[PDB]
């Protein structure tokens, strides 16, 4: 009987009878209050037929209710998919038909237009109960009234913690729902508690999106595991965030640089105490208004990106924080993971040789929802295949080179990377389009470590790279411009 | 979906991630992680060629050695388990242990215990079917561990081992000894929690000066060191200058040391120049008189280093500590990750706040059971809870208090009393150093509560003043009839309380 998420809540209610667990605007909950609510919720779920292996889709922004649902589903051996709130109806429809939830918890604010249309496209296939979460607390088709109708008795079920409990859709087109078990999350949060020096006094601002692994690992689940206080913001607004930092005495946040600079300018000279916040990302941009984190997470450079990982490995499973100075850009595996770089023929690559990053261990997810064939192939031979490219340095460390999905017939990323190991190059795209540093300047011929055949026969130069509306690299934009066709 | 991490995986990852880091030192033996994994693979090879596979059993009958780690890992790569037996076992219990555990293989030691060994084999007679390999042998002894190992090939066994299966067995002593079956998962979880408590990493150098037959040395800090790829330095026995020199030579950050050795180290190192400043002092920091660096980890800061905790072998060690959850009214603190706890009454209903009952547990640190104890395991695991046979209570602030044992009980017309409850509340009195409670026959159905009280040398207190002290925290029907005073409680040669002796001295009897 291994520890489940349910056990974690049942222990914190007895061990921390008066400490704040969740805060969400006006709502505040101690661990007892939360466990009672999770028990009510789990009562009404078991009432509506939800049990082992059943499925729930959250369709909204960040909410304290996400944590509650996860716990309740966990206590029944069910799973919650925290879906993408910005999905247009085609994608939203796809996920619904894919994940096939028995119940859909949804948000009116912001997306009701899209939600409404999508249900109409589903028509008579929409055999799921929908509860509005941001409803008036009386609403009969409402979350709060769904929960209140349940009783306080913990269902006390013997749940296999290897059963999935959190499903994250991972984003070459098609989206797939990664199955993260109770064990995946607890193994992740214990690792993370060591990286961050996280404890019961940790107050963490959930300003990162819960539809994605980032916010969960740093630091949602570890804060939760160690009994810290998780504070929820629906949206990131610099003023409100800055305000919560003071009010909840927050020690950690999930903040991106543009937000931070917004808080800095805005807080300057007003004298509010932001010194309790341990800043992880880009410490200098705070100027000193907050305290520079000295946990291994920041010290090592993992906070700035020194690491490798993915949703399917419960997030950031390899960092410069495990094992010390590393020549490679990602560091080494933390505990609960073993990695090997494998070539085409499934054999271990030699030191320096590039291949696919493959993993086994406790942090490796359970597979994708409803992807039998992709799972069989990705789990071949008792290794999870990440589809990412890497190599081992002689010092032991690992280097993340890029993806293996983008391919050229006899890998681009491998050379994209080699090219970006020129001081004059800022970034490169190989199909070899090149964006140079503003100050440097170098010959196409100097550009042209790798093998006789792998080098391209041409190098264009751009002011920057094309990019999608999300801001990620846009390749099919410049497959056109520079002659890109014939792809295997 | 694939298996969880094993002990074999840990080694496999370290040999790739830390090719030149030192893993094990033992006298002149030094081993980087690749050198250790190749050794383990050879040993695993010869173990498999001898017929050792899943479920099979190896007994170590010796003091601390680097080879012990080698066996654990090698047995773990085959799905086998290693029992680290008590080297100071006398022949009768060496036999019992060998009969009970029934290993296919015995790795034994000649220095200091050979005679005992010789006597025990004689006693086993023609049920002594195991292969015996001498660890500290002449290096070309064919019945010696080194040559047995060198017969193995370098290939990894590369089996799909279930990490829930036992890999380490520690005997825990009524006087009945039982082998606690600890899985790969038990030790990795323990190790992972310990890494957070003591801030352990790859730079850790832990001197293995505690005994490896006991969970202590493993939790602090053998296994977390191993897990985070740090250096493990072994010592066979605990002699202070040896220890002193090895702290200096190997630059250890950590060592397992009780206060008697600390005090002798501090004398011998008195004006020598020797640098012990690397050592982070966890036990009795003041005793070093500045010579080592007081530990700032959560382990020391919380009092957990000084015994503010609760646990046992069956929970993979110290699983409840003041380091988990901050300041605590109870003496034990709170459960770590990997563990939930409840205080259950005699009917199995959960006691109320402040009410004394059996400490019971669930979670990842809980052991797989005792080896070869079907009826007891079935009883001790009743209801999906591990019953610890320890008595405690939850406090108003959610912290836990370890009161003592439930193995002793007094007869009562109301409901059987736990002497450990009364003992504890008497031991609260600030003038009392220790208290022991026995039962005096009072008809067939009950015994009188009799207290034997050891005072602090400079304190006064009457029988009545002690009795009065308990009134508010224990029920009327539990309070003692009489109090006797002693200079010290009698003990065994093991230094455990001798309740048999007290019974005798003050007319105790008529227990359940
Ligand atoms: C979110 C984190 C942690 C989990 C992995 C990851 C990568 C992520 O976005 O997960 P994913 O989208 O589900 O899938 C991952 C896919 O991204 C590629 N990748 C792998 N390691 C990478 C790295 N080192 N850089 C950039 N890309 C990387 C690879 O091809 C893989 O398949 C990171 C991005 C990372 O910049 C941060 C965001 C933020 C919080 C933690 C990480 C932080 C502190 O600023 C760092
Ligand atoms: C060894 C450690 C860690 C593992 C648990 C334990 C207790 C132990 O010795 O395990 P065991 O041989 O299986 O005995 C278990 C039986 O001990 C009783 N017990 C429970 N919590 C206790 C506590 N708080 N005090 C005294 N006794 C306690 C109870 O009845 C239980 O069943 C400790 C004793 C502890 O004094 C230390 C030794 C040393 C290293 C770590 C711990 C250190 C830093 O000084 C602390
Ligand atoms: Cl396969
Ligand atoms: Cl001898
Ligand atoms: Cl009373």
From TrEMBL, chain A:
Domain of life of the source: Bacteria
- The AMP-binding enzyme C-terminal domain sits at 414-471
The UniProt entry, under InterPro entries, shows:
AMP-bd_C, AMP-bd_C_sf, AMP-dep_synth/lig_dom, ANL_N_sf, ATP-dep_AMP-bd_enzyme
Which parts of the sequence belong to the AMP-dependent synthetase/ligase domain?
A: 10-369
Q: Give this protein's Gene Ontology molecular function annotations.
A: acid-thiol ligase activity
The protein's name is: PtmA2
Origin organism of this chain?
A: Streptomyces platensis
Taxonomic path: Bacteria, Bacillati, Actinomycetota, Actinomycetes, Kitasatosporales
């Amino acid at each position: 009987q291994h520890t489940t998420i349910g056990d974690v809540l049942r222990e914190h209610r007895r061990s921390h009878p008066g400490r704040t667990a969740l805060v969400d605007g006006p709502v505040r909950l101690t661990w007892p209050e939360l466990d009672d609510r999770v028990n009510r919720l789990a009562g009404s779920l078991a009432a509506s037929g939800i049990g082992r292996g059943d499925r729930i889709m959250w369709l909204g922004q960040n909410s304290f209710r996400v944590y509650e649902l996860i716990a309740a589903a966990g206590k029944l051996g069910a799973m919650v998919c925290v879906g993408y709130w910005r999905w247009a109806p085609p994608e939203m429809e796809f996920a619904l038909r894919d994940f096939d939830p028995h119940l859909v918890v949804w948000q009116h604010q912001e997306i009701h237009e899209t939600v409404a249309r999508t249900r109409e496209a589903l028509g008579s296939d929409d055999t799921a109960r929908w509860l509005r979460h941001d409803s008036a607390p009386q609403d009969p088709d409402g979350y709060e009234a769904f929960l209140a109708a349940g009783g306080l008795a913990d269902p006390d079920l013997d749940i296999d913690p290897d059963s999935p409990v959190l499903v994250l859709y991972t984003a070459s087109g098609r989206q797939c729902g990664s199955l993260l078990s109770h064990t995946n999350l607890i193994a992740m949060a214990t690792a993370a508690a060591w990286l961050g020096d996280i404890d019961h006094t940790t107050a963490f601002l959930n300003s990162g999106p819960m539809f994605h692994i980032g916010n969960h690992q740093f630091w949602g689940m570890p804060t939760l595991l160690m009994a810290g206080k998780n504070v929820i913001v629906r949206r990131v607004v610099a003023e409100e965030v800055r305000d919560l930092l003071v009010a909840e005495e927050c020690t950690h946040a999930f903040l991106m640089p543009p937000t931070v600079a917004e808080i800095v300018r805005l807080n300057r000279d007003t004298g509010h105490d932001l010194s309790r916040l341990r800043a992880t990302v880009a410490p200098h941009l705070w100027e000193g208004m907050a305290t520079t984190d000295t946990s291994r997470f920041t010290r090592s450079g993992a906070a700035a990106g020194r690491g490798y990982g993915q949703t399917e490995l419960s997030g950031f499973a390899v960092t410069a924080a495990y094992g010390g100075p590393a020549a490679g850009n990602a560091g080494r595996p933390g505990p609960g993971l073993t990695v090997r770089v494998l070539d085409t023929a499934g054999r271990e690559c030699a030191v320096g040789e590039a291949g696919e990053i493959c993993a086994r261990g406790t942090v490796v997810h359970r597979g994708y929802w409803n992807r039998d064939e992709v799972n069989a192939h990705r789990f071949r031979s008792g290794w999870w295949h990440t589809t990412d490219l890497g190599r081992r340095e002689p010092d032991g460390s690992l280097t993340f080179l890029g993806t293996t999905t983008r391919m050229l017939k006899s890998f681009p990323a491998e050379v994209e990377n080699c090219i970006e190991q020129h001081p004059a190059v800022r970034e490169a795209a190989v199909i070899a389009v090149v964006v140079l540093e503003p100050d440097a300047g170098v010959s196409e011929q100097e550009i042209i470590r790798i093998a006789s055949y792998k080098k391209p026969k041409s190098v264009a130069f751009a002011a920057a790279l094309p990019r999608t509306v999300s801001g990620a690299r846009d390749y099919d934009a410049l497959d056109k411009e520079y002659g890109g066709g014939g792809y295997p």
